[PDB]
Design a protein around this ligand. Structure first.
Ligand SMILES: Nc1nc2c(ncn2[C@@H]2O[C@H](COP(=O)(O)OP(=O)(O)OP(=O)(O)O)[C@@H](O)[C@H]2O)c(=O)[nH]1
Ligand SMILES: [Mg+2]
Lengths: 42, 167
């Protein structure tokens, strides 16, 4: 793996991370407005 | 079980200590290696107030400097909020205004707000003068206190105080 490829991979993983966080937020809204009990921690 | 249920949310920059304030209050636990929070969670703790059993429902989520799809639901029904910053990182204090604005745009108008300067154990690295934060709080009608989730200083007091103001 070349240097350019490694830097591109970091950028790619960071972009994916943003998309995953956005998706989690979208899905969580539904949960919070239906059955938020699953969000409890102990 | 309880007489009153009060929803209180934690807000503030990533890394200021929100999750450890939650763990200290609800489980008497601190984790120096805690990782950034994923999703949204809440934990409960029952305390005594004026002879009444109060069930505090504390909500937590990562402090992402961005509007989120969960924002509306997060503040919904909340009667209290802890706006947290890191006394050792002036940047987290500068962002307090941004968090307060977000709160004013989604939370109930009568929500009780307490400005919390966490990580007081790092006083040797203080970057936010106590007097300045207190001035900002009183100016915006916010309670104020400095805490250390690490050594536990004022953590119980912070929650007890805000819950007492709510009730
Ligand atoms: N020195 C010191 N460190 C603390 C204190 N409270 C939390 N920390 C540490 O600061 C780091 C961040 O703490 P967290 O509680 O995960 O911060 P957070 O606000 O929940 O961060 P996000 O979930 O990313 O929004 C961790 O390494 C904690 O152990 C404190 O009072 N003093
Ligand atoms: Mg957290």
């Amino acid at each position: 793996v070349s240097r350019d490829e490694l830097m591109e991979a970091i950028q790619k993983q960071e972009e994916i991370n943003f998309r995953l966080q956005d998706y989690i937020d979208r899905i969580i809204v539904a949960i919070m407005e239906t059955n938020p009990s699953i969000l409890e921690v102990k | 079980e309880y007489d009153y249920l009060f929803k209180v949310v934690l807000i503030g920059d990533s890394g200021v200590g929100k999750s450890n304030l939650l763990s200290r209050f609800t489980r008497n636990e601190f984790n120096l290696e805690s990782k950034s929070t994923i999703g949204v969670e809440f934990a409960t703790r029952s305390i005594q107030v004026d002879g009444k059993t109060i069930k505090a429902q504390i909500w937590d989520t990562a402090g992402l400097e961005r509007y989120r799809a969960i924002t509306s639901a997060y503040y919904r029904g909340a009667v209290g909020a802890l706006l947290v910053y890191d006394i050792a990182k002036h940047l987290t204090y500068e962002n307090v205004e941004r968090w307060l604005k977000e709160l004013r745009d989604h939370a109930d108008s009568n929500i009780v707000i307490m400005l919390v300067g966490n990580k007081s154990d790092l006083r040797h690295l203080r970057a936010v003068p106590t007097d300045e934060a207190r001035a900002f709080a009183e100016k915006n009608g916010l309670s104020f206190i400095e805490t250390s989730a690490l050594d536990s200083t004022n953590v119980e007091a912070a929650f007890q105080t805000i819950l007492t103001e709510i009730y």
